[model samples]
Structure formats: C-alpha cells, structure tokens
Target: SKEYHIDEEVGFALPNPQENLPDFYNDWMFIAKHLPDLIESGQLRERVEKLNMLSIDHLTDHKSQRLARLVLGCITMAYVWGKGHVRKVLPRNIAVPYCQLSKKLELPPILVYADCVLANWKKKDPNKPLTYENMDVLFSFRDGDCSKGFFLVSLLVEIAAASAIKVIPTVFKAMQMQERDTLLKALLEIASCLEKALQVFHQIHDHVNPKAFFSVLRIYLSGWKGNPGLVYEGFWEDPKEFAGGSAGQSSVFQCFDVLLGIQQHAAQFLQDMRRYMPPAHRNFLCSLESNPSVREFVLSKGDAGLREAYDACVKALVSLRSYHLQIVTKYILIPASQQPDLMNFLKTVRSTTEKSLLK
Candidate 1:
C-alpha cells in the first residue's frame, strides 16, 4: 500500500496523532502479519535461505524494497533519530530471517527511511499527484489510541530526511554517478516529504498560528540563534538542539558543511555548529565528508561547474525553506503571532540563505 504524509496526525490540537506501531511500520508489518512462518521457524530457513529476495524480479519490486527499508529503518530507530520503541535484541524468528535477508541484500541494517519515504514523494499513480490529492490514505487519527506526540515530529522527520538529501553528495561523491543520481533523487524525496508536512501544517486554522505554534513548538525546535551567544525563538538551533531530545538535533547538516568547502571559510563558526551533534554521528559525517562532490566538480569542471552544481543543491535546500515559509504564513502568521512580522523575517531568510542554512 502507498503512504502519504497527510494520512497521519500532526500532534497538534488533537489529543494524539500517532496511531499504531505500523503507522510508521506499515510496510514491514505486512510480512510479519501475513507470513509469520517465513519469520517464525527453522523449517523455513531451508525454504527462505535459498532465495535471493532482493533479486527476484516479481518480488523485488518497490513495495518489497519499501518493506526492506521499513524493517531496517524501524528496527534501527531503536537507536537512530527520535527514540520510542527500540530493540537491542532481535527476536529469534525475526532476527535470523532479517539478518540473512539483509546479509544477502548487502544493505545497512538501517535505511534512513526518513530519507526513503521523503524521496519517493510522488504518488504511485501519476495521474493523482500533488500531496493533498491523496488525503484519503494520509490522515489517520488513532482509531485505537496514542499518547499522541508533538506535531513537531512531522518537522523532525523532515529535518532528518532533508538532511539526508543535503549531505548525500558527500556520501556518494566518489561513487558511480548513476548510483549517485539515484541517491540524490532519494534525498530530494525528503523535500517532498517536508513539503507534505508543510501542507499539513498549512491548514491548522483553529487557535494556532506562527507565533502560537512556536510557543509550544519552538520550545522543541529552538536551537542556537547564532555565533554561540545568540538565540532566536523562531529558528536556528542545530547540533545544539539535538541534546534538546527533539528531532532537529538528529541532523546531517554538519555533514553538509564538511562536504562543501564553505566550512573552511567559516572555521570559527563551524566549530560551534558541529559541536552539538553526537560524536558518533559526527564521526560518520566526517568519514563521508572527507572528499566532496563540489570539490570533485571543481577539479574536473572548474569554478563554473562547481558553482553550478553547488547552487543547484543549495537551491533545493532554500526552496524547501521557501515552502516552510509558506506553511508558516498559513499555520502561524495568519492565525497567531504578530511580534516579528514573519513576512519580513522570512524575506530576510530568503535573502540570507547562502550565508546560513535555514532550518
């Protein structure tokens, strides 16, 4: 089945937004539910072990791929981004099968699913595109129950997914361009995911607006304002925010800085930005950041080429921010606060994106 951002709750005015385990794990639950045996017994090992699930033309389709991603990403969530359910130990029936399948597939135990879901932003049916058009499948209130969560979770999901897009060039800068393009598209899918989230937030017209939403929301999204001594109630707050125990802290922007040479020029500032992220994640970013795509472009295509590709990627990020501003106007500006005059603030953001990455 297809998934859409609108189908889920935003954790706003509603008592709760999160529904069931499969709300986030829809793709994986099917296998566990429908084919319990495949994951349940030693008898199946002889049957399942001999097969290349990732290679079977009929079975190795998008849904299957999505399941693979869901399984790994959902499980990995035990430690990855925002944490809720986690499993340090896999169930025998599940672990044995997933491990063998993962081993055969040669994929990471996790899929950066935030990356995967956002990347495939389009509808399965081309004719019914544009996010809102698929709302029937998107908005699901807890038919059962949920403590609900801060709607910020949607934005948090976007942050992680978008960061994946932002930092990928660094991840695959040295790989085959073909695979790189696919990965890049996967990154862009995150923006679409973000866009869908924006659309959802866009309609919260009852009691909240930009400032109103911020009062509770920013308490979570808020990170450093700038240069260590500053703070903005509306945005900023990067690796600094991670410890806040929210999703924004789980970012890959520092990874973006390492990939682009821009960090070298802002050496003093870069120190503060990266300092907030987990050391382990920071280490991973550095490993991928060692050599960047922009650097490669400069070496091969010179200044013009490097700037062209760099601008394109930056443009994507800025465009995503632009979409965020649109949501701010609808979700916040129209309904809630009037203190800073967000119209002007967002304009300032539009003008200064190159100087700093907008959250």
Candidate 2:
C-alpha cells in the first residue's frame, strides 16, 4: 500500500495516502500536482506549449476551411460507443469541457469534439436520419444545434465497470480475504450493464449495417473475455469457452426480446391503471401512448381485435399495479438463492455460437 503525509494547513492528504482513496480522485490529484512542475521545468513544457499553440493556431487559421475529414474519425468512435448506455448517462455538455481540456493537453481536439457531438447525437430518436453534410453544417456554423442529449449515462456504465475493476482489488486487499459473492455480484452487474449497452447499439443500428453491428458486439465480447476469471468464478462457467457451445448466440436475441417485452409490459401495465384510477392517473397512462415507438407499434397493427387486446393488456397492468409489482418482486428480486441459477442460465445462452448451434 502507498502512503502520503497530510498537509495540516490544507486539510488534504497527499496523493496515494496509506489508505487508498477512489482511483479517480487519486489520479486527478496526482496529475494536478505534477502539471505545474512540468510547466516550471521549461524544457519539456516548451515543447508541449508549442504543440498546443500549433493546434490552436490551426483552429484559428482554418476557421473557414473544411476540416470534416479530421472530425469524422472522432465522430465515428463516439457514435460506436455512444449507442449503449453511454449515450444515456454521459452529458455532451460535460464532454465539451473535457474536449477543451484535451486540446489544452495537446491531445486531438477534433476527436474530442467529435466524441462530444456524437454522444449528443445518440440521444435523438434512432429512427431519425442524419447526413454527414448536415452534421458538419450544424456543428461548425450552428454551434452544434443538432446535438441531442448527453452521452454521459452510457459512458458512465463503462466508467463504473473500470472503476469496479480497480476499486475491488483495493477492497479485497484491505480485507485480506476474498468475498466471492460480493465480487461475483459486482462483476455480473457490470456485465449486465455492458450487455444492455450493446443491445441498445444493435437495436438502433442493426437495420443500417448488421455486419458492423455484429463487429462492435464482438469487440464487447473480447472485453468480457479479458476478465474471464470474473465471469468464471462469479458467473460459475468455464472461462476458456462460452457455456453450451454455440447456444450462447441466442442470448442477444433473448436480451433484445426482453427489452421489447418490458416496454410492452410497461405499456400494458399503464393502460390497466387508467380504467379504475382517477383522472390524473389515467392521464399518466394516456401519456405513455404518446411514445413514438409504442404508438407506431400499436397503430401498425391493422387488426381491430389485436389492437383491442393490446389495449386490454395495458389496462389490466395499470389497474393491477400492486399485482404487477408483486410479480416483479417475486420473480426478479426476492430470492437470493436463485441468483446463481439466473447467472448459470445467462452464461449458458449468451453467446452467438451457442445460439447459432441451437438453430
């Protein structure tokens, strides 16, 4: 364990105090302390300053010039990662400051900007089409008007997982003993979040480019493979291979189906509440019908009988919120003993190979 002395006047202990703090706080504090030393040293500082100035000069000089090529690479990476939960959690507004900091640090500003913009773009309706030309026009001249929502939510999931990997070791070291159940639960939660993000990516982009979508999924799988011990011990499966051989392929579709099913169930649940509830509560159910996806799905069914049945399902759910809650609590939450069983079920069927073999 690393140790540091506390500065009594400042009330802030030096970085890497004998007791470890969060990794992010430690890293930031370390960087903050050293950045000034580097600047005062002059030799290394001059070179870095020149690089930063040159980048700023380029941005200033080429204000009117076409720089879309430079920006596109950043956008692509941002868009690729943004689809998952990253798009939901990470705010583009926060990303902008980080992008500026990257530029100050002599990192690629265009890439950083692209990441910020792409993250914002992901928040908009996935069905909406956007072109490169429009994106460029919106960003350069319009001050990024087209940028939609923060990608922070999506990025945070990855950040959290990475944080867990770092923090858990410190936790285990402090305890001087392994907590298998705790570690397993944490790993599984991270996996679930990552898987959910990938599913969102696929849902939004599968129609555009199925191959590319699968490729990105493969990358996520590779990440999962890197931490196989977590999967094997925590998930209780052979780390060397996916469970059930090729049956794992079906897990993607299963996840996809489950997401849609949840949404549908929510819709049904809301509808049922409308019938017996007061006007305000009924209005809440009516608001759900406004969801563009749900609206489209329901309206697309031309059959009157199917539509009525769907409406009835929604009504039943809303009317019986307590019942629905009970169902979720019993099936999903209550049984601590069933957790390992669920993990086994997930591991056995989460791979493309496993799913393809089943077919």
Candidate 3:
C-alpha cells in the first residue's frame, strides 16, 4: 500500500465526492440543502432539534463516509452560526451521528478545510474544464457567492499545485543521482506552478467581497477554540476546542514548505494543524519532511546553476507569502479595525492573537 495517496491530478483533494447518498441519509441531505434558507428563516434549530439521530452503519465506504462528514459539518456550522449568537453545545441529533462519522473519518466534529473545501465541490458540467465558471460548492453558509469563491479559490490553488506535486518524486531522484539539469528543471516547474497558483489565489477578490468575507463567511469558518469548549452533548462529556479553518491548513503550501525546506514562522502551530488534515495528507507531509531535503542537496553541490534555481524557488514562495500578507491585511485587519463593537472585537481578536503568541 502507498503510504501517501496524494493524487497526481487533485493532490490532497478528495476527487469527485459522491453526489448521492443512501435513502437513510435523505433527511440529513434535505437539512443540509436547506441550511442557508432555514437559518435565514429562523427554523433551523427547530428542524435540527426534530431530526432523528441517524446512524453511520449505512456509511460503509470512504466516499460515502466523506460525504456524510461534509453534510454533517455544514449542518453543524449552520446550527452554530444560525441564530446570530454562537451556540455552546451541539444537540444530540447531529452530535451523535456527526461524532460517530468524525470518529470513522479521523477528523474533528466541526467544519474544516478538508470538509469545507477539499470534499465540498462539484462541477456544473462534466464536459467543461474545472474553472470558476464550471465549478461550485456543494454546500454553503450565508455568504452566498463569497463562500463559493472562497472555497473555489482554495481548490484552484490545490489544482495549480498538481504539476508541482507530480514532479516531487523526480526532484528527489534527481538529487540522488546528482543530475543538476534535471533538478534545475524540476525546481523551475515548482516555481512556475506556485506562480500560477498565486495567480489563481488572486481570483479570490473577484469572487468574494472582502466585507462579506470578514463579517459573514469568516464567522462560519470559525472553530470551537474561541468558545469555552464546544460540548457535543450526549457524545463527549468535556467541551473541545478546535482551531478555525485557515490557509495554514492547506497541503499545497505545506508541500512547498517541505519541498524547499523552509522553516516557517510559527512552525509548531502549523504542525498542530496537521490534525485537521486528512491522515494520508498528514502522513505525506511527515514523509516529505523526513525525506532528504532538496535545500541541503543544492548547498552541498555548490553549483551556481543549482543555487540560482533554488533561490528562484524560494523567491517565488516569498512573493506568494507577501501577497498573502497583503490580502489578509485587506480582508481581515482593515475590516476588523472598523468594527462597531470594539470591545467584543478586541476580546475575540485578542484571544486569537494571544494564541498566536503562545504558539
């Protein structure tokens, strides 16, 4: 068995999640499909409270299990983010099956990047390319088009990394054989891929309104961390905390980090985020980190060509990170600075800042 099954086409993404589920899941699907509307109409909690606690016995395969997680994750997010105020506990109806499915899938009970983005998309037409025009999210929160854009931009980044991922093994082998030309070309390809991915990343502005992203979408993507603890009633006695979905959870960027041997700022926090990643993808990063690094190989050779190409790879990554900083400043910090409830905003932002400092 392969230790890491990161697909050549999709990388860490769960390719083409099943659109259909068994009859037993009809109620859950119905709730999930009507989530945004139900939440808006203020009938979400009543419907959710009335839902029969479904079982995971019918979920026998990987695809089905993942789709279940996606469905439950969306519902859970909608439940919490529905009433304007955060809910501290998840009711038993969703908690039971969702906790069970999370146990089966080895993911957290809350919504995550893997569930929100990786397994959350479907194509409009099978015949068309996987562009923004053809792709859309399977589930959504109140952010509407902004949420779709947010999710799609993230997926496209993964898509953009596919070529770079495809060349990773060859980069390792080329280094082993001391093939400077082959290694050079591979590094160039990786850089080119990152550049393309950054271009796709910029498309986020086109799809998402930053104000909507900060005020509406970001709240749903929030985790249980800010709360005292999310008590999954009837499932777990203790409240649990999980970090919200962030770009830090993306495997593509982590892959780049491992490939170029860059030790990122706040490295341990990034390590902690591996728990949110699919197990195979986590193991893949572990394997990549443990593998002989391309960085050391270039230094050992002392070849000017290798050094130049290696520097180019790192420079491209730097540009990408710089742009990311600019985007965060535009989307988060700017909006947050002008919040009406300054004290509450500070309290929330302080909690997050304190965690970053500690980590």
Candidate 4:
C-alpha cells in the first residue's frame, strides 16, 4: 500500500478539538460524507480518473482530436476572457477538443486553457519574453512537458463550471425562464466534481488558503454580476445600469473589472489569511505589485478605444500569468525570498469602495 506521510511542519492545523470546524474542513467533510453517493452516481474518484485517462489517451492517439481542439479552444476562451476577444484564426480543431473536455468535466475551460497558454508563452517566445503574441498558443503546449499547466488548467475549468451553476439560477429568473432539469442536473454534477477535485488538491498540496480560494470566487462572481437576468431573455435593460454598468459591460471589460476587484480585495483577504498562510505566500503577493501586467494596464490609461481594450486585455493575460506564477511559487518552488507579512500588509490597504470601483 502507498501510504501518504503527514508533514506537520507544512500542513494546516486541525481545529481546536471543539470549534465546530471551519468551512474549509466542513466542506471537505461534506465531500467525504457523500463520497458514497458520488461513487454510486458514477461521479467519484474512479470516474474522474477514467475521464482524465481518456483525455490523455485522446491526446496521445489523436483519436477524438476534437477533445484536444476544445482544450485549445478553451485556452483561447481563457485568453478571450482576459483579452475580451478571441483572435481571428485560432486552430478550431484543437480548441474544440479542449472546449468539449471542459464541458464534459464541468470545468472552466477558459481558465484552464489560459494557464496552459501562459505556461507555453515563455517557450514560444524564447527571445521576446512572453509579449502579447498569438494568445491561442497560451492555452496549451503542442507537446506535453509540464504538469503544472495541466493542473492549473484543470483547476480553472472546475472553477468555471462551479461558477456557472451557482449563477445560472439568477440568470434564469432574470430571463423569466424556468431552469431546464437536464442543464441544472448536469451543472450540479460539474459543481460536485469541481468541489471534490479542489478539496483533493487542497489536501494534497496544502498550499491553498481561504483567501486564495475566495479571490478565485470573486472573479467568477464578477462575471455573474455582468450576466443580466433579462438579457438571457433577449430583453435589454437600461444600458446605463447594465451596459455602462458592470452587468452590461463587454466580457473584456468585465475581465478588467474582475482583476481590479481582486487587487482591491487582496488586503482583507490577506488579513484573513495571516493566521494560516506563511511569510513565503505573503512575499509572493508583494512581488505581484511589480508584475508586468499590473504595470502595463495601470500605466496605459486614456489610450485609443481599440488600443485601450487591447492593452487592457494584454494586461489581464499578464495578471492571469502572474496568478499562475504565484500558485507555482507557493505550491511547487516554495522560494525563500517570496516570504512577507502578507496579513498585515493586506490589512493596511483594505477598502470597501475600491471593491466596487473598476479601473
């Protein structure tokens, strides 16, 4: 039997024998409690493993090449989410497979694709150093080399799927339509799978904190905010409130808004994390201040409309890439210089108004 060792030095402390356990623990417990149902319903670890194997097999044999295409497509979608538009000629065959896998797995195809794309960005431009080139490639590497890319992509897909289910009810109500049973059930399945997978990763790596998880949620919630209830019904509400407003904004604009929101919320979330996260995580957050994406977008204000949008999109990708970097640093590299007093630093910059305001 393969036994996993418990590293007390790095692992999170369990609750004080009687604190009713935190949401994170409760969430994991709930999954553990319901493991039987998930297994019986064919949505548990075995099923997921099978699906993953199928995905890899497809990638290897070039069978169901569409799955691979959709994976690539989702990567493009991820870029689009950040950039606000897909490039003119992304390889559809690759993208389609990527997208389908995302759908089948009930994952955020865009986020996963984005991670894969970003991971590949540096390799694609050895000399140029990852400037905004053809972003579709940022979705996935042509030949598989890195596991982190796949993990990040997988994580994002799950996040997206979970978010879609959570927000769909509001959307359906706003559109004055009853939820379709099939769609609802399917979404629920995706959400369940996402939750389980996230928990497994959380337990296995023990690097993710509540703040980091919530920040990801905030991005999805921001998107949910843009999806007007009535818009789904083909009824346009006041453009000022919906369009000029966050809800009416284009996907690209919404991505910008989400990034800004994440920055604003970082302070409070960091404070919450102080008790749990170490100095290393804190330092990573601090270094993000100087990230290229952050600098480019912040400085490129008042440019031409298309140019502004393009710059904003580019910045968003940079931000997303930065996020990928932070995750890697925290979980994989565990660098020494990346340490800092994350909690106190974040607390000093906290602002409620900033959370609502978009750049």
Candidate 5:
C-alpha cells in the first residue's frame, strides 16, 4: 500500500531546513535575514528590485528548495504589505525565481502555512527538545517578538501532532486485523495527543498579542485574493488569487478529521485549502481517508469500550476546533469589526472559519 513515513523527530516538518544557500544564492538569504530591518528602513522594495536575478536551478535538494520557498515567501509578503498600501505587481527579479520555486514546491507564490509554520522554524540550541520555548522562527515581519511567538507556537502544535500522526497507521492496521483492544488503545492515544496539541495551541495567547497580530503582522499574511490578487511580472501575465497563511491550511488538523471520519461542512473551501499544504501531507490524508473506515469499523461492533474510545477521539477533535474558533474570534473577529475598511476581507475569512465548525 502507498504510505507516508511520518518522521519520528520532525513529523511533517522539513527536517534540518537549510539555513544557508549556495554562494550564488546568497542575495536571497541576505534579504530574508534582514527582511524586517529592510522594510523598516523604507528601502525593501528598492533593494528587492536591485536584487541579483538568481536561478532556482542552484537549489538542487529538497531541503534547500523548501528553504528557498520560506525565504522568498517571506520576502514576497513583505514587499506587498510592508508599505502604506499593498503593491500589486511583484518585480521580475523576485517574481521569476519565486514563481519557479513555487511551481517546483507545489505551493502558492504567497506565503502559506507550510512556509510560515511547518518549514520556517529551527531549534535555538540544537540540543534541546523541540518545545515552544526552545523553538524560534527563521524570518520575521515588523511585529517584533510577537511574530516569532506566533510561528513558534504554531510549530509547537505541529510537534504535538507528531505522536497522533505516527499512531494513525497503527489504528488502521489493528482494525484490519480485527484487534478491538489494539484499535481502542490506538484511538485513545490519538485522543490524548489531540489534547496535548490543543494545550500548546492555547500558548499562542501567552506569546502573541491580539493587537500586534491584527494590526501589524496579520496584514503581511494577507493573500492576493480579497486584495485584487498580484501580477507576477515576467512569469504569469494575469494576476493570481491565493489564500494567505491560515490555520485552515494546516495539514495536521485535516489528518485528524480524516482519521475520525469527520466531514467538514465547507468541504469545497477546506479542500481548496489543501492546495496550500505540502503535497505529501495532502496525499497522506487521502490515503488515510481511503483506507478502511475506522469510524465505521468501530460502529459495526457494539463493544462499549471501542465505541467510547472512538467518541473520545471525536471529542478531542471537537475541543481543538472549538478552541480554534475562540482564538479566531478573539484575535480577528472582534478587532476587525472595529475597522470599517477591513470588513470585506474579514467577512470572507470569518465566514469560512465559521463554516469549518459547522460539521
């Protein structure tokens, strides 16, 4: 059977993301490293325009490719949203390689969850465990430490999902063998893991302030969609529309939904969000969903423990989604309601988020 090997150490995260690129690509790395400073200096677009038109061909390996995506994605967001108003056309020097890399990586040219959270983090000490405190982001916007906390907390949630992801196949295997006890155990393990992941999800409040996120950093995450899209000059002739970095683009949560046989009410939009995820993770979800139904398997039997365990997993998933709704309400809905001009963009986001919880 086709399968995904979820790494024991990094899970879905790109392990050991290349912090540096080849000498020829040093220009990209320099801009990414000093992105916030450059934006603050009011010379980011000027510098980006003058940037060396490097080739994506030098990015040979998977790790380097992902690093390039993260670097370029961050730089792209900054160039568009760094100034007083959004810039509609990206320059050729940045747009050409960015579009090429985005095509190679199967991601949108704009920053997505995969770029911002999944592959954007590194261990501060390299020896410590991948806890929230020990983790830090590789790039930043002008939101200072708040931006770092936002990404790190999101990374921690992914780290928490690793155990649940690892146990997914175990539950499937046990079900195929009709081992009720083993299936129950695996289901319970998944529930506990979800709870742990949700616990870390709450840490976002401790790290990121609502004002900083809503006012400063969140704009950078805004996509080309509601803002009239962008023209990747010298690449695509017309403007492209893509969603920004959002929790809806997260793969780990969708994996849980697949494992538990929970169908999202807004299936079309949620499925579209899959485009923003890593392809391997999206395939993993498809495989897990196509595998013999764990939910049906549990329902076929009247065993009380098995039924209760399945319900426990479902319960945990609900709790996590509920907390997510709460966070979005706190960070986005309430703040944006005060700003009349941001209402249009906020409506699309708010409706999609509400629809996600309908199931």
Candidate 6:
C-alpha cells in the first residue's frame, strides 16, 4: 500500500488478522462486541502459554508473526480475562511479548510496563512487587514482534489509560487543588508519564532491523483499506470508525481537559475514548471523570487563580505534544526517509493534543 519493504523475516500477530477483516461498520461492531468475551472464555490462556514459550524466530513469516500477535494480544487478553490480577507465573514470560510487541508496534514495552504500573498481576507471595529487576530481561530483548502500528499503538493507549488512572485520584476534586503548587506538580507528573511512554517509540530502531520495521512490518499497520475486499489485498482493513489514529492514543489531552475545566460533554467523550482501552482500565477512568476538579477550581479560585490553573494545564500539554512530535519524526517519518511524515498516522492526536488550554 505505501510501498514498504515488509521485512517478512518474521510475524507478530496481535490476534488473527481475520479478527479485523472488514465487512462493514457492522463487522467492527461484531468483533468489538464478541471478540473480547471470546478471548475471555478461558481457553486462550492455553494458547497464550504455548505461544509465549516459543523461542525467537522459532517460526518465521506468518507463523512467527501470528505467534507474536497472539503473544501480545493474548497476554493482554489474559490480563483482561484474568481481570488484571492473575496469579504470577514467571515475569520472564512477559519479556518476549514485550520485546516482540514493542518492536512490532514501534512503541515501548508498555503493556508490561502497564502491568507493572497498574500492579495488574497479583503475586502469590504477596510480599514482592513487580520490580524492574524482575522485568530486566525486557531491557535487552530482541524477539522483536508486533502487527503494524494500529494494533500495537493500542498498547500506548492502554499505557495512557493506566497512568491516567493514577493521576485521577490526586486531582479529581477542588479540595485536592487547595495546595496550588502541588496541584501544578501533579499535572506536570501526568504529562511527564505520558511523554515518557512515547519516549520508548524512539527505541524502536534499536530493537529491530530498522529497514524491516519501516517497510515490511509497517505494511500490516497501514490503513489503505478502502474496501473490505482489500483484506490482505494490501492490508487488513478495519471497519471505518476504528480505521485511523495509528500513531498513538494517549488520551492525556482528554484527561487533562477534565482537570482544567474544558469540554462541555466530557462525560460522553471520556467513555468514547475508553472503548480503545480495557474494561478494568476504563472502569477507573469513569470514576475519575465523575469527580470535578477543573470546574470547581475555576469557580472557587477567583479569576487570578483560574488563570494560574489554566496556564499550568496548557504548559503540561504543550510539553507532551512537543515530545510526541520529536519521537514521531525520529521513529516514524525519519525512518521512512521521507521529506515529511506529518500527521498521516497521528492526525487525530495532533489536532486534539496540539491546542492550548487557556488560549
């Protein structure tokens, strides 16, 4: 579709490519409604375990690629099925998936990061936390698997979702903002966490064969499907509404808007983005949205404090977009060796995140 080289050295399956074969708007709805529950039916744990055990390049072409996707998707789906706190097997099991998914998706090893951040995996020992030392294998890993930017970008969206849930409780109410400096610090932390994840995208080149990641593996992530028949004709087509936003889906912008008194219909909008996230993840965001910090700050802070709060929010967001732009250029546009990648993949995020709060 985009004249990419398609490394074909290996495969990275987020799930069956058939899971996304375009039928119509209805097909997307069909899978969206049914697929998660199907993944939840408990049988996938077996497949996930088997796939997780395979060595790198043990299978190549579609087999390894399919293995990669199932590994990434199945692990996430397993967490979903296990409801975030599954019994700890070996944390090392997550290393290959993280390496493969990060390489394939061109994002950081964030699903594992999210699992660590959210503490989604419960410990049988209950004394030790999911530690960086335990996840050390992920640092030098090279299984290097993923399914194009679309499915892989979902990891970052989930990462954003995971981080945002932490920020919510601190800033969800006006009383929490009484200490103005701490409030600003909290907002800054939220932005920093978000940019930190995208920061990993820059490492994509380091993890995989740069040529392979840019050309061949990228073809699967491409959104050239103008028709359902184009399924694997060029790329697997997504039903229209889910078709775009391949770059990333942090949703930090929307969450910040809530903390800064923006968005008239924030309630509905928050839920809409949450669809791109997991069930347990969104359940927390929903509760966060219900608490009104930004609006209350504006009402009680007087005009001057209102100005202060607004500017802090804007400052945080500007930093996020600035960081994202630099990463996108390096990992995406620059690797393509193109004049300008622009917002072809990250367009929605560009428009949504580029604007300032107080302006």
lDDT of each: 0.37, 0.27, 0.80, 0.30, 0.79, 0.39
Using TM-score as the yardstick, the better of models 2 and 5 is 5
1-359, model 6: which lDDT tens digit per residue?
01221111101101112222123223222322333353446543443444323344433453334324433433433332242223223234544544554455343332322221121221233355322222221111012323223223333334443453355456544355476665655565665655554554544444445444555344323322231311111111321122212332333445455555554233444444455433333444455566765645655655565455456555655565566676566556677776252554344444454453543
Question: Please, what are the lDDT tens digits per residue for candidate 2 over residues 112-198?
Answer: 322232122221332433222221112210111112111222222222223222332332332234343443344344334434333
**lDDT of candidate model 4 versus the reference:** 0.30
Compare candidates 2 and 3 on TM-score and give the better one.
Answer: 3
What root-mean-square deviation over C-alphas does model 6 reach? Answer: 15.8
TM-score of each: 0.36, 0.22, 0.92, 0.22, 0.91, 0.45
Lowest summed lDDT over 10 consecutive residues: which window, candidate 2?
9-18
On lDDT, the stronger of 1 and 3 is: 3
Model 2 TM-score is 0.22
lDDT for residue 157 in candidate 4, whole number 0-100? 31
- The regions of model 3 sitting more than 4 angstroms off are 1-3, 143-145, 341-359
lDDT of 6 at 90: 21
* Least accurate 10 contiguous residues by lDDT in model 3: 350-359
Clashes of each: 14, 36, 0, 30, 0, 13
- In candidate 5, residue 90 scores what lDDT? 94
**Where does candidate 2 stray beyond 4 Å?**
1-106, 117-176, 206-359
Kindly list the per-residue Cα lDDT of model 3 for residues 1-359, writing each as its tens digit: 15576777788888888877899899999989887788888988888889888879999989899989988988888887775566778999889999999887788787888988988899899888889999988888773638889898889988888878988888999988878899999988887887888898789888888888888888788787755478899998998887779777888767777787776525566788888888888888888887897877888775787777777777777667667767777888889888983234333432332222210
Q: How do these models rank on TM-score, best leading?
A: 3, 5, 6, 1, 2, 4
Query: Which 10 consecutive positions of candidate 4 have the poorest summed lDDT?
Result: 240-249
Give lDDT tens digits, candidate 5, residues 1-359: 22454677667766667777788888888888888789888988888889868889988988889889989998998888876357879998999999999888888788888787877888888887888778778888774538888988887888888878888779988988988889999989988988898899778888898878888888788887765478999999998887787777877767877777666535666788888887787888787777887767887788888877887777777677667768878888888887873344334434433433312
